[model samples]
Target chain A: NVPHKSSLPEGIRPGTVLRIRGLVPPNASRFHVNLLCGEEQGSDAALHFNPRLDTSEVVFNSKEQGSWGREERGPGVPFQRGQPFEVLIIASADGFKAVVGDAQYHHFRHRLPLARVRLVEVGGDVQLDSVRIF
Target chain B: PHKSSLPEGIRPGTVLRIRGLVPPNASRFHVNLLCGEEQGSDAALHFNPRLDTSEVVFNSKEQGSWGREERGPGVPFQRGQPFEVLIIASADGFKAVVGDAQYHHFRHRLPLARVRLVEVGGDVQLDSVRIF
Candidate 1:
């Protein structure tokens, strides 16, 4: 788990956007983005975006009480090896909307309150260039 | 045509990355970082990649007139290929990384701080855009 984690200056709320720029390695097998309720190891995850290149699918879920919820799987992955990516996760009243490049990718309903999310973690077979929340 | 406003404006050390796919029959495409939302506004950097002639042109415009074109490097775009363009703001100019591999530098003819909008139009479809 080669990961990068940071606390949000303020808790995520509706209209907040988290933007990440990265490059997928030629042999990448997977990558993930997590919005956490806290920075601790056992902190609950409000949202988990896991894109599995090997399976060409994305799994979206939430974790509470140290256990993950039922997985919501997307049919296909939008990532390409050796290519750069721009990902935006926008907070909405009902859910978080994920956009890749210019395509609407996924939507994960709020399993945890938006105001509880204070940390974001990104990891996997990708080279991250920058992460900014605004 | 796709355009987005950078409300915070571009500051030094900021990197604007745009990912998109070139259409299969693409002949040319353009990306511009501009000072304002209007069409006649000064262009901080205008990048036009012409596949028709295999040339990449760079230029700046202020007050509705374009300066001489800088065909410094030839075109790097390919038909139907996915591309990522990273434009980095520096104190004096912008450094562009094409496909995370090729480097193209364009000196600021207009103030970088004045650039508050991005416009992309042509035969390509944008996938994502980020300014950070």
Candidate 2:
């Protein structure tokens, strides 16, 4: 699995706060960060965070039972191309809240259980540095 | 570059699978099945895909010893693309495939049974290596 999913030493829990650091390539169209239930092709995504640079928007959603639910778009794209960024996803009893520098953010109510997130993936035109959780 | 031991060595029925990506500005990528882990060791197979020439080359090296190279007409891959490279060992030669499509074949120069290591390197992003 090259350019594939990474395993979570311990799958996420209610108090888990996940962090990802990476650099968006120049003139990138979009990139994605996914917290998945498994690494297999059909595994569901607990969180599907996508930053669309071309559209200047951030979208969040979840995939369950092999299909995607409605996507929630955040206002304005606080992310810049050719820049490094950090994203924090904090999990709670009710939902998952995502924060990217300053006040730009998104929250998706639990469509997929946090406790089931077993893999982490980053894709698109971005140079990923790390993915951590506590 | 990535390296791993071939505990069983390659045999008639062995399958070698590599998952990797072709970098946006990649010039070439190589997959070498070596006979040992040391410098100047023999390589049973040297499979190279060169983007500049759009050719895939195959050869073997026994130290400074080298075999006649077998270069492909053209490669079926693109820059910034993902590829699954498969090499199957058979009694007569190595059958190479990129993403399930038949690609090229190189006959044994150094015995396949002597292979103990494999190195996948060059301007490519290797995701995983599996031999069985």
Candidate 3:
């Protein structure tokens, strides 16, 4: 089971820009951050806010990844612990344009509106120091 | 646009007991909460953590919501501002069973593992008082 250690520092808004800097797990196969917007626990309705999903799914491809012709959660680009990964999320009318570092990682368009999302969840077991929204 | 508010009280485990007692929006349509887990921003892979989804979809159905024919995020049972909601989540081998305030709200099984999830995003703009 995953430990719910950390959460988002601020409430999510459209055009919100956030920077996540921290230490990733040493033996992680896949890793991502979650900015969820929902009301109940155990509901898959929670938004999975990662630049990469292990495998591909169909619906996620249609709603967000249209024209991209890629996997729903995109491809997992491996990262080392010592290396700091930077992700920038720009919420647009359609969806969110997500970029991890310089790589045009993936775009998470709106299945639900950004204003509707109230909570931000970070779903990994790591120590994070600071998250700044500018 | 909502405000960036407080966070969850504890680390989300398989069977975490949580009581959400606070003020809900005075004017509302469908309102719930969020609990997310992912790694990057703008990546839709971050899990939308509500028990209710507005409309319906196919993939959320195929992976988790099979057998039971329903919308992806479940149905929104409205609540009042002064009222409190209690939720208990038990992680089974495959998925998680969710209950809200004595109502069998819905069940979200796994397309992914809980261990795969490292963060929890508590969406919404409200002061959350913990009952643990």
Candidate 4:
């Protein structure tokens, strides 16, 4: 995974939460947001978080394999192309609580704390805007 | 773009700002969140938001040319992969004010009003779930 140019949001403590806002072009049909949970941010940011294979799996260790409609996509729900959307991410002891708008999203459990994430990277066809820490 | 599983939120009076929240996997390093703008929630989302060429362009319809660090990435700025992030999308009559967090993102000026977008698409190598 690529390293973020900046640091993770504050309030990202154990159980800390944050919000990510941005836009997606109409050209994009399927996309993914990989979160690194741990005590340090670097190429090893995802090290302590383990669950590598579970990274895309919605059912604990089972990869979604590109099924956007599958459970691996998480809760709340992703927004369609060319539209604005909102989501809520809460930091948990294990990982984080994800939610889209008022919708309930999936829980991403990590093995590390909130001090690992150093820089954030946006590598894809999508155009990201911001990340808010609560 | 694919149709949304649900409907857009309320407050479609010219401009509206929303915060998208979700959990991203550590495996996905790249991702995209496409927003549809215009009037009425249907397949005609990005219609009025004409700037297709500018869609990814940091400047006007010039296309960022896949230059993430260039301009098109927008203000506040986009977050990195393998981490939790938030984005603020402000609805404007022209298009939308895109922001990452506290950072000042780019302005997505559309050609129509803010009642169009019906669905959001995340088509790419990156795996995205939540479109808050």
* Predicted complexes: DockQ each: 0.04, 0.01, 0.01, 0.04
- Candidate 3 local lDDT, A16-126, one digit each (tens): 444455565554444545555443464222246543323322122221222222336455553454455655554444566555554556666666555555545454545
Give the runs in model 2 whose Cα sits over 4 Å from its true position: A1-134
Deviation from truth (RMSD, Å), model 1: 9.6
Residue A5 lDDT, candidate 3, scale 0-100? 30
Q: lDDT (0-100) at residue A105 of candidate 3?
A: 60
Best lDDT among the predictions, by candidate number: 1
Whole-model lDDT values for every prediction: 0.81, 0.78, 0.37, 0.36
What are the per-residue Cα lDDT tens digits for candidate 2 across A101-133? 534276678887667899888888788777655
Q: Is the docking of candidate 1 incorrect, acceptable, medium or high quality?
A: incorrect
Residue pairs that clash (backbone atoms under 3 angstroms), model 1: A101-B127, A101-B128, A102-B127, A102-B128
lDDT order of candidates, top first? 1, 2, 3, 4
> Candidate 4, which segments miss by more than 4 Å at Cα?
A1-4, A9-11, A37-42, A45-77, B1-132
* lDDT score for candidate 3 against the true structure: 0.37
Candidate 4 chain A vs. true chain A: TM-score? 0.58
RMSD of candidate 2 to the truth, in angstroms, is 14.8
Looking at candidate 4 chain A, the ten consecutive residues that score lowest on lDDT are A47-56
